[PDB]
Design a protein around this ligand. Structure first.
Ligand SMILES: O=C(O)CNC(=O)Cc1c[nH]c2ccccc12
Ligand SMILES: O=C(O)CNC(=O)Cc1c[nH]c2ccccc12
Ligand SMILES: *Cc1c(COP(=O)(O)O)cnc(C)c1O
Ligand SMILES: *Cc1c(COP(=O)(O)O)cnc(C)c1O
Ligand code: NA
Ligand code: NA
Lengths: 393, 261, 393, 261
């Protein structure tokens, strides 16, 4: 039995070993409880506002669009404490762990940002946090690894399998299944077994609510399209949710195309992968033909999740959302362009979403359109990779 | 086929509990794997439990994670494991053979076709580690349609609702888990399982010494399964294949002997 | 003739070569004009809000103060676009350059942050920006140097004299004095020749106005003290100004004590330097006894300005403000402590101000007090220096 | 003393314009500096202009920034420069000697005491590069009290208000700047300056060839000052001290000759 639907059409579910179900049922229950509890909401609202900085601005970029008939706004999650949208849902998940009486937090991280984020929520809120990270990513994310540790978290490297995020995601589960009674598993994206895709969505949705209000305030009407990168789905579902019932509003998700779809070396399972069952759920997966899970590739470390949230696969299948891809070059061009014409260094991740907006504008410059891009994070962390590339080139 | 029902009845006429070791197919290589398996049988296993190497075995501990990696170092694929199974069934008629699968490998090229391929190589059961009863329908159906017994794990904290689902939906044997965590007080489940006419329980997770096999049977379980310990042996002996089989032999005999009246 | 007083008691003035005065008179005039112009104010308010993120939160830190009778709030300039308070005044100065019809911006920078800041304001607002930076700081601030250049600014290294910020400050002047007619000099602190200390103050004062409102909202009354680091004076005067007429409100400025006042190797000219005339003004200077200007030392690169704003020297001399110092160790302890108990990585600069608050609390834990610290920036940029120190140690 | 008034009157009786080179004291070293200075005189300078090395000479171009650095490489300090001045006055009675100072070095140990030390070594004027007329009071006072002429710069864009301040407040000569920028159509200022009985103007900044000295005098300026060019010569000859003095000699003679009737 669950209280909510664990499925978005055919995708989603709860595929975990039997020993973990009481944990997901308990979590679902505590989340359902929390959403009707005014104290919980007021406490969440208060950290998002006075600790994390909400609401985030909505920024019109006239320099980018000049000479065209696009108007473009970026929702500045790069301004949120922590530097990316992930801090929203971690605070919510932490209050949940609290509300369940758990005292420890477990989280997985690839590029480091969800690990930094769970460690900051943990420190603030009195939880003991341990983070799993694949040794390959450890090697290549020392800033992050040191940030989490300055914040009292313990960082545990994962050496098995490809040693990256999916292997962190396995190690997180293994641990949860023997400590769930005291620990809560702060999953890092809107993915995984129910009720996580729904709870991550609901704790990121303020991004779309505030967008809507702001755009109505500044323009008098809803956008023609909202665009967001899609690594595992949290920022995009966050920007989309509140516009889902607004049929005239385009939802465009951007998955990394890496060196190029035809090359194989990409991160776009929703449009170029194949349905599978992994990580607690049924969704598009990057996988071989025999069914082993493979890694996602992208010039940006954070769109590494080799699968995608179920709700996006559903949205796609019914037509209600559109998903496209943007290559590393395209995303680097968009990065450059923002730095030089609006003076915002966007994350390479959010670079993908900006890049598809710029294509929308450029390919048809006399089309009349009002776009919002979700600038899911800041790109300070990417300054050197862009540096090394522009040097080799 | 009814190999489990047959074994169970035979063992029950001997007043014996069942002893079933687990290995990963193709670890450390195919040939050596086939020899390990034959040695496990020749030493006394009542049934096998065999894993198909998978990239992301989120319910296993390190030991068996190394086993999959070694199997992958040697190129072993599912299509190879099935050929392995086939020659195992060819060599041994009556031994129940259960697979331990992860969901993706069964759902990959169509669920039904996975259970059909199981039937044509002679497999008797399949346990899918990351599909809970709540999500078992498609998998249990496809299983019964091809005569394979779908195995389920009964957790130590299982509540009565779950007990009944397991007893209703499983066949061949019931995997009685001794503990939470990953591979590395049961009297109640066991009585309740008999009460609901579950398939006979095999106690699993952490069985590594003969005393525990004996203790399981006394508790009322029809038997015990041991894998980590079996894999440990492999992983300890990689440098000498012959010593590998010899220690496998001795451990299995010791385990089997303990289930005896 | 000027329109406003160029002096704060004995300190300040306009000591520039005669050729630059028409430029400072013109600037003063344009600023006086702007402050009475509602269009200018509305345009400034709109970038601070929808481009820079204002207002910034005020954050209560219960974990830090537990067990004591201090209540501590940090004003989160670390959340402002750009990551530090400097973005406020640069946007104001840029609109000024605009209003004067200039098209080019000139700025000096030490640790990089004022250079990044002037380059982002420049990019947004259509100005051509060149930045002067001392070659020693160039060497040691590559991230910053590359950030400014991604944002279209030209970075010109200064090799003369100690090759650091003061030598950048000279090179800025030299250039202004031959291009002032098209270029505006975006000075980076509340220092230098009038009208800069007054204009930087007035374009940073929103930090104290919002603090006041927020603290009245959350606590019902004004703080007992506001504390802020003092590198050249802009963030602190920004936090102080609006509380100056509130006599019961303490203003405490924190200058870097470096390895220790007695050692000589510090950055605290206001309390441990000697009055001099340099950089367009009369104020406390780090200087030899014969009168050559020396460098300020500190573990944090941004408190390097070897002098201090005039208005702070005045405030100090009349008793209305207090100035203290905090050493590198003390500032590193405070850095650590914030990371681990509130999950905010503060800038080493703002670390000094937090450190003095913690002393206020620790030395008298049963005193009843409500403190605000101005967290002037984020410390992402300092992660490695703290790393290397904690490794050697 | 009245050395400037005296020189000017003498030059005026010769129908001559004045030629005054600038150097930094102690560049490249003290001894060599003293020899440079004597060579400048022996070659014909009418008055000297001497800088005291300072750390942050924000109104000078590279050339003279190198001069201060070389002077600092050699340890030269203000107290040393004053001893230098003293032996210069001892050697040459009547030559006007002006200093080019930065504010801090004059305000450092008390403004009044700086002008007093100027008087005791025999200095005649002091120009302080970063003190505009608007801020000149303390400096001009202290100057007149000790008989030193306070020099001011009249910028090319000077408006009538400024013209009058300069003419009122300066003494000895007026520094007529040829251009904005740092060290590296004047007829109106010059007439207006005469009109307000300013001290005689010396045209400065960028004078480096004899033609310009001649052009200044024709314009009505009582003379021209050249420093960058003089310093260039130094900096070009550091490897050979003797060639240094010889080229200094030739350039100065060439400059001086050009101011002649
Ligand atoms: O390692 C063991 O001791 C026992 N293992 C089994 O019975 C085989 C097994 C491998 N992975 C699993 C996941 C869930 C249930 C059984 C297994
Ligand atoms: O370099 C020159 O050509 C002329 N320089 C002078 O007349 C001496 C000088 C040095 N620095 C200055 C700053 C302002 C005015 C004169 C000077
Ligand atoms: C982590 C991250 C993402 C990708 O994860 P999502 O769940 O897909 O949003 C995207 N943008 C930024 C800045 C990220 O940090
Ligand atoms: C630049 C900076 C300072 C120092 O300059 P002020 O004018 O003294 O405020 C302080 N804190 C941060 C974060 C800075 O970037
Ligand atoms: Na993905
Ligand atoms: Na200072």
């Amino acid at each position: 039995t669950t209280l909510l639907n664990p499925y978005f059409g055919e995708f989603g579910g709860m595929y975990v070993p039997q020993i973990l179900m009481p944990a997901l049922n308990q979590l679902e229950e505590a989340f359902v409880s929390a959403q009707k509890d005014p104290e919980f909401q007021a406490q969440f609202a208060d950290l998002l506002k006075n600790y994390a900085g909400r609401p985030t601005a909505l920024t019109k970029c006239q320099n980018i669009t000049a000479g065209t008939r696009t108007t473009l706004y970026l929702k500045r999650e790069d301004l949120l404490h922590g530097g990316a949208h992930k801090t929203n849902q971690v605070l919510g998940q932490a209050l949940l762990a609290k509300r369940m009486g758990k005292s420890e937090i477990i989280a997985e991280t690839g590029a480091g940002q969800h690990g930094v984020a769970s460690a900051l929520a943990s420190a603030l809120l009195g939880l003991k946090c341990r983070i799993y990270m694949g040794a390959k990513d450890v090697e290549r994310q020392s800033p992050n690894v040191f940030r989490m540790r300055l914040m009292g978290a313990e960082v545990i490297p994962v050496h098995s399998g490809s040693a990256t995020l999916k292997d962190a995601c396995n190690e997180a589960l293994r641990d949860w299944s023997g400590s769930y009674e005291t620990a809560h598993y702060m999953l890092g994206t809107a993915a995984g077994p129910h009720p996580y895709p729904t709870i991550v969505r609901e704790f990121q949705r303020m991004i779309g609510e505030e967008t809507k209000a702001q755009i109505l305030d500044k323009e008098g009407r809803l956008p023609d399209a909202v665009i967001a990168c899609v690594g595992g789905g949290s920022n995009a579902i966050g920007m989309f949710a509140d516009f889902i019932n607004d049929t005239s509003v385009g939802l465009i998700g951007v998955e990394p195309g890496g060196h190029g779809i035809e090359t194989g070396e990409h991160g776009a399972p929703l449009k170029h992968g194949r349905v599978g069952i992994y990580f607690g759920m049924k969704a598009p997966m990057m996988q071989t033909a025999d069914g082993q899970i493979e890694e996602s590739y992208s010039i940006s470390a954070g769109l590494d999740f080799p699968s995608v949230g179920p709700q996006h696969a559903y949205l796609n299948s019914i037509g209600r959302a559109d998903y496209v891809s943007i290559t590393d070059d395209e995303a680097l061009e968009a990065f450059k362009t923002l730095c030089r014409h609006e003076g915002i260094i966007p994350a390479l991740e959010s670079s993908h979403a900006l890049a598809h907006a710029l294509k929308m504008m450029r390919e048809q410059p006399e089309k009349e359109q009002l776009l919002v891009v979700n600038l899911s994070g800041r790109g300070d962390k990417d300054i050197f990779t862009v540096h090394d590339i522009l040097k080799a080139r | 086929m009814e190999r489990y029902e047959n074994l169970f009845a035979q063992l029950n006429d001997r007043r014996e509990g069942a002893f079933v070791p687990f290995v990963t197919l193709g670890d450390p290589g195919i040939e050596q794997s086939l020899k390990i398996i034959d040695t496990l049988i020749d030493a006394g296993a009542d049934a096998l439990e065999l894993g198909v190497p998978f990239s992301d075995p989120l319910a296993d501990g390190p030991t068996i994670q190394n086993a999959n990696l070694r199997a992958f170092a040697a190129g072993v694929t599912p299509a190879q494991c099935f050929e392995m199974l086939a020659l195992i069934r060819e060599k041994h008629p009556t031994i129940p053979i259960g697979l331990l699968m992860y969901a993706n490998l069964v759902f990959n090229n169509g669920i039904d076709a996975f259970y059909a391929r199981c039937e044509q190589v002679g497999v008797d059961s399949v346990l899918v580690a990351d599909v809970p009863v709540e999500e078992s329908a498609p998998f249990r159906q496809a299983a019964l349609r091809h005569n394979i017994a779908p195995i389920f794990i009964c957790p130590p904290n299982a509540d009565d609702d779950l007990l009944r689902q397991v007893a209703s939906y499983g066949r061949g044997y019931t995997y009685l888990l001794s503990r939470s965590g990953v591979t590395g007080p049961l009297h109640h489940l066991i009585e309740k399982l008999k009460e609901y006419h579950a398939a006979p329980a095999l106690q699993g997770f952490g069985i590594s010494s003969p005393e525990q096999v004996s203790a399981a049977v006394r508790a009322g379980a029809a038997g015990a399964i041991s894998g980590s310990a079996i894999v440990k042996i492999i992983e300890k002996n990689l440098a000498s294949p012959k010593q590998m089989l010899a220690e496998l032999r001795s451990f299995v005999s010791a385990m089997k002997a303990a289930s005896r009246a």
